[PDB]
Amino acid sequence: SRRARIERRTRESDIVIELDLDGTGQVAVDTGVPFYDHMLTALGSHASFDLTVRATGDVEIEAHHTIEDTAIALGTALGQALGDKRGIRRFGDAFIPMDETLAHAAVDLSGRPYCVHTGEPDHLQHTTIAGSSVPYHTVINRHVFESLAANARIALHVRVLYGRDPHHITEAQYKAVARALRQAVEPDPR
């Protein structure tokens, strides 16, 4: 019913997305960027989407191209799956506490792309989350939210009220976006 498959092939990367808005959190994400996989898994899961993301790209340069192409493809999938948007809540918002961090997201499935990203501490503009694989530059958080909003053609407002840990700050925002979208896409009984 509210399903979309998107294939996005650029010079930099290859994305396949399958998205059901009316899922149960059946999520599988593989981008070659394990922190990004974790954020997109949290997003699909907390939005009660069924979501599959398979992506490969030029991670020898860094994660940016793959992260962005994935967020563009995912936005386009959200846009297509929503269709005409008849009968939905349209507006959604969620607070996510994560230990010391409090994040908020608010959505209007308006059909007009807009993203306002505020309150993220300045040190996230040069912070790296790094393990044994491809690292994740938190400066990309904004870019992901912008790409998503631009291609789904929605208003997306993401706020960090406060926080310290860059992992708590980043995950709280992805989870906020996710639960905001969940409320906004659900059928409006009136």
Ligand X SMILES: C[C@H](N)c1ncnn1C
* The Cα angle at residue 63 between residues 51 and 26, in degrees rounded to 5: 15
If you write DSSP's letter for every residue of 110-140 in order, what string do you get? -SS-EEEEE---GGGGS-EE--SSS-EETTH
Task: Return the number of the residue (88 or 146) whose C-beta is nearest its own copies.
Answer: 146
Judged by CB under 6 A, does residue 171 bind ligand X? yes
Judged by CB under 5 A, does residue 68 bind Mn ion? yes
CB 31 within 8 A of CB 67: yes
Q: In this structure, what token pair is assigned to residue 11?
A: 């010079």
Site string for ligand X, 55-74 (x = CB under 6 A): ---------xx--x------
d(C-alpha 98, C-alpha 171), whole Å? 8
Judged by CB under 8 A, does residue 100 bind its own copies? yes
Judged by CB under 8 A, does residue 137 bind its own copies? yes
Strands 128-129 and 114-118: unpaired
Residues 20-39 that bind its own copies (CB under 8 A): 24, 34-35, 37-38
Judged by CB under 6 A, does residue 146 bind ligand X? no
The DSSP H or E segment spanning 69 is: helix 64-82
Judged by CB under 8 A, does residue 114 bind its own copies? yes
Among 48, 52, 70, 173, binds its own copies (CB under 8 A): 48
Judged by CB under 8 A, does residue 8 bind its own copies? no
What end-to-end distance do the CA atoms of the chain give, in Å? 20
- Residue positions forming the annotated binding site: 12, 38-46, 64-68, 90, 112, 143, 167-175
Binding site for ligand X (CB under 6 A): 12, 64-65, 68, 167, 171
